[PDB]
Each structure stands twice: as C-alpha cells, then as structure tokens.
Design a protein around this ligand. Structure first.
Ligand code: HEM
Ligand SMILES: *[C@@H]1O[C@H](CO)[C@@H](O[C@@H]2O[C@H](CO)[C@@H](O[C@H]3O[C@H](CO)[C@@H](O)[C@H](O)[C@@H]3O)[C@H](O)[C@H]2NC(C)=O)[C@H](O)[C@H]1NC(C)=O
Ligand SMILES: *[C@@H]1O[C@H](CO)[C@@H](O[C@@H]2O[C@H](CO)[C@@H](O[C@H]3O[C@H](CO)[C@@H](O)[C@H](O)[C@@H]3O)[C@H](O)[C@H]2NC(C)=O)[C@H](O)[C@H]1NC(C)=O
Ligand SMILES: *[C@@H]1O[C@H](CO)[C@@H](O[C@@H]2O[C@H](CO)[C@@H](O)[C@H](O)[C@H]2NC(C)=O)[C@H](O)[C@H]1NC(C)=O
Ligand SMILES: *[C@@H]1O[C@H](CO)[C@@H](O[C@@H]2O[C@H](CO)[C@@H](O)[C@H](O)[C@H]2NC(C)=O)[C@H](O)[C@H]1NC(C)=O
Ligand code: CA
Length: 595
C-alpha cells in the first residue's frame, strides 16, 4: 500500500516521445515515470511531515498543544530577538557582488513556488483575516508579541494564509497535507517561458514567424526591449504610485516584479531570447516560428544551468561542493528530480544576503543623479523606476559594482525586509519576511533542526553547551535556547542560517548538505541536462562553455565595461575590462545544411 494514485488536479497530456525539446510543464522528462519534475504536483518529502495533529495543523496553531513538551515561540518574537539589527555599516560581503544575491533568487524562482490559497475572488476571508486576526481555516495570523513596536501603529497581527496543497482545494483530510510546486523542478528557465501551456503561449510573439517573445509596445529602453505590461487589475505596481500608473511586468513566473533588481534580470533574459532567435534565423533562414522558439529556448536553459553549476554553486557550497555534487557522469533515470519541501526553506538563506539600498550608476560608474542610492523598501513592486528613470543600464551596473550583504550572526536580515516588506495583496510596507519565513516552515510541516542534522549525519546538540559548540556563538545559542527550550524545536530556517559558514562558502554544514543534495539530484535526474550526451552535439557544447554572465550584459544593454568574473567583488575601473575582451557565444554549430 502507498496511496500511490492521486494524480488528480494537474495538467496532463501526451508525451511527444523522442521530441528534442522539453515540455513546458516538465512532463515527459523521465520516460518510465512521466510526471516526475512537473509543475503542479506536490513538493517531494525527504522526511515525513511533522504537523500538530499529525495530519495538517501546523505547530503553534492550537495554543495549548506543545511541540516536545514546549510552546513554540511566536514567529515575530523569534524575529525581534535574533534576526533583527539596526546598523548597516560593516555589513557588506567583501567578496561577492550584489549579483551574487540576485542570481540565487532567479534560480530559486526557476525551481520552486508554494502559492497561497485563494477561495475568494471576493470573500470576507481575505478581509476577516486581515481585519480581526481571527485564526481559522487558511487564516493563520502572525500575532505580535507584547512590546513589539508594530502594535502601536499596525494592529494585532500580520495576516498570513496557509499554502496550497495537492489533491483538491476545499477543506481537506486523509493523508498529510502536501504543498504544491507550481513550477517545474528542472533548471529549465521556466521563469522566462512559463510552466503552463496557456501562460507560455500568451508570452510568445505569435503575430510573426520569427519565434520572438512578446515585448512591451508602450515603452522602449534606448531601442532595446522591456517585458510586456500585465492585463491584471488591480495592479500593485500601480498602487505604489497612483500618479505614475505603471503596471507590473508579465513574465513566465508571477513574482517577477517583487523587486526592481529582479525585474531587471527578467528583462536581460527576455532580451537574450529574442537575440538568440534573430541570430538563429540568420543562420538557418528556413527554420520556423516554433523551431526558432524552442532552439533559442534550449540554448537559454543551457545558460541558466551553466552559470548556476559553474559560477554560482562553487561559491555557495565552498569546499563542500566536491562532497555533495561530484563531477557529472550521465543521466541517471532512477535519481528523483523533484524539488523537496525543505529545499524551499533551505534556499531562503539568500534572504540574509539582501542589503538595504539599491544604486544606479552612470557611464563611468558614478552616482547617477542626486537620488542615486534608494532604500530597498521603496523598490518592492516598483516598475515605474525602470520605465521612467533611466531604464535597465544604470541598474545593471549597480549589480556589478556594489556588494551583497554578508550573513553575520548578530546581523541577519535588514529591517527593509524585516519591518517594511510590501505584500502585493495588503496595503502597507510593514510586513516581516523573517517571521513569515518562520510561520511558513510551520505551515509546510517541517521537522525541527535536529531532525535535519540527523539527516545529514552531523551531531545533534541536546543542551546549551552543545548548541554553543555547533554554532560557535555563546550568546546566539543562549537566545535560541531561551525562546525554544530545546534544540529539537528550532525551526529549520533559523537553525540552518544560524550555523557559521563552511570554508570559502556562504552557508553552513546543514545548509551545504540540503542544497548540495537538491542540486546533485536535479542535475543527475534531468534527461535534458546540457552535458547529457546526445542533447547538444560536441561542437555546440564547446560553444556553450564560453558563455558567461558578463557577455550576457555586453550583448543586451549598452554597458561597454564589465568584470570577467561577475559574482566576485569587483572594483571600477581596475577590475573592469572592455566588452571586446570577453568571449562571445559562437552560434555557428547550429547551422543546418539541407542537401
Ligand atoms: C524582496 C525579496 C527578495 C530580495 C530583495 C528575496 C530574495 C531572495 C533570494 C536572494 C533568495 C535566494 C538566494 C530567495 C529565495 C527564496 N525566497 Fe525570496 N525574496 C524576497 C521576498 C520573498 C517573499 C515575500 C517570499 C514568500 C514568503 C512566503 O513564505 O510566503 C519569498 C520566498 C522565497 C522562496 C520560497 C519560494 C517557494 O517555494 O514558494 C525562496 C527559495 N521571497 N529570495
Ligand atoms: C574572491 O572569491 C573568488 C571566487 O572563486 C576567489 O578566486 C578563486 O579562488 C579559487 C580558490 O579559492 C580558485 O578556484 C579555481 O581554480 C582554477 C582557476 O585558477 C579553476 O581551474 C577552478 O575551476 C576554479 O575556478 C580560483 O583561483 C579563483 N577563481 C576565479 C573564478 O578566479 C578569490 O580568491 C576571492 N578573493 C579573495 C582575496 O578572497
Ligand atoms: C510618482 O511617480 C512619478 C514619476 O512617474 C514621480 O514624479 C517624478 O519624479 C521627479 C520629481 O521628484 C521628477 O524628476 C524631475 O523632472 C524634471 C525634468 O524633466 C525636473 O525639472 C524636476 O525638478 C525633477 O527633478 C519627475 O519629472 C516627476 N514627474 C511628475 C509627473 O511628477 C513621483 O516622484 C512618484 N512619487 C512617489 C510617491 O513615488
Ligand atoms: C511581434 O513581432 C513583430 C516583428 O518584430 C513586431 O513588429 C515590429 O515591431 C517594431 C516596433 O513596433 C517595428 O519596427 C514594427 O512596427 C514591426 N516590424 C515589422 C517587421 O513589421 C511586433 O511589435 C511584435 N509584437 C509584440 C506584441 O511584441
Ligand atoms: C543511479 O542512482 C540510483 C539512485 O540512488 C542508484 O541506485 C542504487 O544502486 C546502488 C549501487 O550502486 C545501491 O547501493 C543503492 O541501494 C541503490 N539505491 C537506489 C535508491 O536505487 C544507482 O547507483 C545509480 N545507477 C547508476 C548506473 O549510476
Ligand atoms: Ca524550472
């Protein structure tokens, strides 16, 4: 017995079989088991879920049931006590560009999404939850602690709605609650093309057979493209400045306009597609609307994979890279490519990497104008700033010249995300990403810190002093222990991120294991991995290794000076070489001789 069946509410179709192109939904990747890795199926479970009532109610819900004989602390008090700080000076990561943070978020959005539950295209629950903090059904309010300033000016709580879950929607039972992943598990650039057939089509330029992706028709950027605007009303990017009224952008992933430096990357990517498609059409003039589309689309997914495995992972895992992700050896059809529920929390380490301001630089990399640097919190759902204040360039240069925040145990998440986050549904810039992350662990039913330590074959501290040694911090260890009473109860997000960093890495032992594990699996489990023999020819592969994030900027914006290594901290102008000195992608191996 297994319950095996539940293959209900999800998009299904026919396996094109032998087709050299991925499906949009990720179906048909694994032949013997066609729905592994597909958008709209449950997050995988590496360990059984731990819910309050065994089946679905999160810990903290019933105000009188303990977890291990103890009351779990309030998300927001774990925030106020451990995650907060006030001094931004000293905080910058001395050897990582602001693009280090930015790439983690693009990869993240390619791999996982647990959407909120709706049940109201009008309903008093999307307002009985915000107005009265009444816990009930999918309303699971983040209550304020006594002494939280936010009591004085905001209300009794921050509203929060539980995540969606497989099988039906309505009030549900039987099995443990399993959250949905609305995105494909494969590094396949789903964030650019969509994970659904319908959204995928809307995105395309289908008025002409050049296989181009739709581009905004209302605004231009020095004759270079922007993403289309969204039909969607109401529109939070609009609500952010009623005078400007500039809507959010339409991309293959819905979160694209969360912040300005993420809308920027989306737009460098769309631009890469269209570029690829024109170039390809020149070489092979008989190719197709569809054929141009898929071929450019296959080059792009190779891109996201190569920069990810070659440039970004080696510097997150550090010395632990070799031990979790060994060198590639071929597609293994038994490896399970599905993104695990815990990964979507482990991958939240990047939160502690976001700094507090965003800069715009002019052509010599000098402060563009008088209001160059801005508080991150005015940039949530802000598109009016790209469109009406210089477009993309001034904002890509800041990504190469400025630095990510460094995780630090006494400074974890800047207040910009911690006190001032705009959620695209509600009205204020007053949410807290840290508390939300914690409340979210609980909703998704996560095993505690020791469970995962156990999982990764690392010691499990049971006492103050043990916790002190693992964390190599006396004080942090003391706060955690005062809020939680036992390490067994420490939520994985805050435990994972509290560990000191492995050598040359930017996460700890627990985090290197869960990430390292996930990445090995999605590479080993992907029939379309770029080095998978028979997916690109040997000469195409040789061409694809020369790609770099720098080139991408050269070919797609008017920046003429860039770093060679783009994730490392780089000083202008010593570290900046001219575009000409940067290897170009040689598209000639994609030539198709008819006779
Ligand atoms: C604003 C937000 C960011 C930048 C200023 C930001 C950044 C990151 C980075 C750098 C990540 C990894 C390197 C990363 C991972 C994931 N985040 Fe994201 N994030 C901002 C805002 C949010 C919000 C709001 C959420 C949702 C919180 C919730 O639980 O409802 C959020 C989530 C995630 C996430 C989980 C995705 C999923 O599977 O649902 C990451 C892996 N971020 N962020
Ligand atoms: C800032 O971080 C840089 C990130 O890698 C680092 O430079 C890199 O140092 C590592 C070893 O710590 C080396 O790893 C490389 O080894 C050779 C390149 O010579 C390659 O064959 C490997 O695949 C791998 O890339 C490199 O020597 C170097 N890598 C790069 C990309 O240049 C700097 O040392 C850091 N700066 C400081 C002072 O901390
Ligand atoms: C709402 O969005 C508006 C932009 O679409 C923005 O107003 C704009 O911003 C500044 C003023 O702060 C102006 O920039 C400069 O414009 C002219 C040059 O042509 C100068 O002479 C001015 O002195 C000024 O420095 C924009 O022109 C201005 N535009 C309009 C129509 O008001 C608002 O700032 C946004 N408000 C919020 C709350 O974010
Ligand atoms: C779809 O593609 C066509 C072909 O590129 C676009 O039409 C061109 O767009 C630009 C900007 O308006 C102009 O040079 C011409 O108006 C068009 N040129 C040709 C060859 O006709 C069209 O804008 C694209 N549509 C969308 C929605 O992005
Ligand atoms: C592909 O990976 C699978 C999945 O882990 C491997 O299957 C294992 O086979 C080994 C022998 O090498 C056994 O020790 C394990 O108990 C098996 N585990 C599972 C989960 O099946 C397998 O090693 C790999 N196959 C190839 C040819 O690389
Ligand atoms: Ca994907």
């Amino acid at each position: 017995s297994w319950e095996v069946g539940c293959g209900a509410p999800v998009p299904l179709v026919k396996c094109d079989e032998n087709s050299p192109y991925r499906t949009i939904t990720g179906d048909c990747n694994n032949r013997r088991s066609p729905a592994l890795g597909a958008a709209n199926r449950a997050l995988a479970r590496w360990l059984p879920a731990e819910y309050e009532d065994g089946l679905a109610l999160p810990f903290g819900w019933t105000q009188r049931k303990t977890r291990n004989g103890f009351r779990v602390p309030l998300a927001r008090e774990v925030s106020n006590k451990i995650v907060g700080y006030l001094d931004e000076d000293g905080v910058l990561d001395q050897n990582r560009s602001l693009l280090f943070m930015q790439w983690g978020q693009i990869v993240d959005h390619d791999l996982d999404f647990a959407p909120e539950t709706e049940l109201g295209s009008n309903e008093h629950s999307k307002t009985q939850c915000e107005e009265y903090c009444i816990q009930g059904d999918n309303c699971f309010p983040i209550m304020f602690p006594k002494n939280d300033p936010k009591l004085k000016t905001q209300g009794k709580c921050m509203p929060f709605f539980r995540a969606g879950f497989v099988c039906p929607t309505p009030p549900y039972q039987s099995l443990a609650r399993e959250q949905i992943n609305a995105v494909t598990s494969f590094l396949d650039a789903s964030l650019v093309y969509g994970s659904e057939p319908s959204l995928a089509s809307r995105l395309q330029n289908l008025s002409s057979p050049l296989g181009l992706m739709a581009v905004n028709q209302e605004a231009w950027d020095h004759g270079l493209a922007y993403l289309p605007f969204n039909n969607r009303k109401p529109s939070p990017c609009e609500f952010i400045n009623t005078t400007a009224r500039v809507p959010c952008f339409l991309a293959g992933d819905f979160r694209a306009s969360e912040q300005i430096l993420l809308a920027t990357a989306h737009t460098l990517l769309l631009r890469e597609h269209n570029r690829l498609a024109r170039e390809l059409k020149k070489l092979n003039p008989q190719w197709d609307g569809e054929k141009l589309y898929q071929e450019a689309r296959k080059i792009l997914g190779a891109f996201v994979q190569i920069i990810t495995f070659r440039d970004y992972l080696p510097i997150v895992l550090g010395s632990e890279m070799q031990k979790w992700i060994p060198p590639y050896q071929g597609y293994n059809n038994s490896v399970d490519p599905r993104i695990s529920n815990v990964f979507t929390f482990a991958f939240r380490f990047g939160h502690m990497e976001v700094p507090s301001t965003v800069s715009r630089l002019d052509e010599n990399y000098q402060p563009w104008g008088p209001e160059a640097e801005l508080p991150l919190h005015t940039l949530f759902f802000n598109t009016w700033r790209i469109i009406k204040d210089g477009g993309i360039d001034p904002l890509v240069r800041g990504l190469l010249a400025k630095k990510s925040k460094l995780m630090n145990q006494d400074k974890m998440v800047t207040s910009e995300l911690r006190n001032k986050l705009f959620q695209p549904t509600h009205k204020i810039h007053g949410f807290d990403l840290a508390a939300i992350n914690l409340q979210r662990c609980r909703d998704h039913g996560m095993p505690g810190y020791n469970s995962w330590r156990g999982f990764c074959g690392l010691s499990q501290p049971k006492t103050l002093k043990g916790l002190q040694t693992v964390l190599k911090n006396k004080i942090l260890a003391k706060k955690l222990m005062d809020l939680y009473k036992t390490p067994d109860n420490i939520d994985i997000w805050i435990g994972g991120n509290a560990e000191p960093m492995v050598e040359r890495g930017r996460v700890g032992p627990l985090l290197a294991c869960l990430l390292g594990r996930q990445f090995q699996q999605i590479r080993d489990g992907d029939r379309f991995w770029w080095e998978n023999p028979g997916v690109f020819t040997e000469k195409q592969r040789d061409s694809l290794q020369k790609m770099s994030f720098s080139r991408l900027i050269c070919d797609n914006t008017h920046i003429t000076k860039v770093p060679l290594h783009a994730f490392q901290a780089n000083n202008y102008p010593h570290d900046f070489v001219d575009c000409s000195a940067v290897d170009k992608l040689d598209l000639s191996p994609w030539a198709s001789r008819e006779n």
